[PDB]
Amino acid sequence: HWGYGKHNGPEHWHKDFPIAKGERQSPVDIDTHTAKYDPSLKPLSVSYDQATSLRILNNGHAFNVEFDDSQDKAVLKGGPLDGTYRLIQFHFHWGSLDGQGSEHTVDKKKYAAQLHLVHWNTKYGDFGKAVQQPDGLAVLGIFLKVGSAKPGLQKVVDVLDSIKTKGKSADFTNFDPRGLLPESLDYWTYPGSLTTPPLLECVTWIVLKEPISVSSEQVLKFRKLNFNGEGEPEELMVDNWRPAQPLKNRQIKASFK
């Protein structure tokens, strides 16, 4: 029912999901001069060498690449986190034009897309229990800007044809998520929420300062997907991003000065 259109888009979500107007909603604009450099923040630890990708799926709002999360094979720790967080899936948010598409913005600047690597706190046993906790998830957000091609993104781009419409899925094994990381792991961090319904306020956001660049032809392929299911009128999957929410009672911390 919810989507990104004029009739069921972000401005309407509060009717079915009242938490939409909550105290710790995401995304938010990152004001770099107001962000507090915090020296007690530990470096992030990304251990994705044993990652096992399984499937790619068009869910009607974005495409998700899913990972085997039955064991600690791809984890995130350190930074502002306590405990180990397992990678369960990653997905993107993009625009109809290169000047918009990201959910978070930096001093109001919008990027072409935003990658979200979603992890859940192992102390809670499964993803479903984790979303019910204030520290249940850790999402790593990476901005994409249009420039040179990202070689490690091509495997994802080539398979989009196969999952053009809502509900389609394809086997997607042996994909290494390390190919999507920028050089630097400097970041901003703040307490927030999922950016799509149910909008649960269970996320510790870790947004990387350095964007990765992808080519114009790579982002073009994303824009060829459909929100609709097979046999329905075609609605191109573009602009699946939620606009920035007020910061309210929160402080954004930076791991760098």
Ligand SMILES: [Zn+2]
């Ligand atoms: Zn997302």
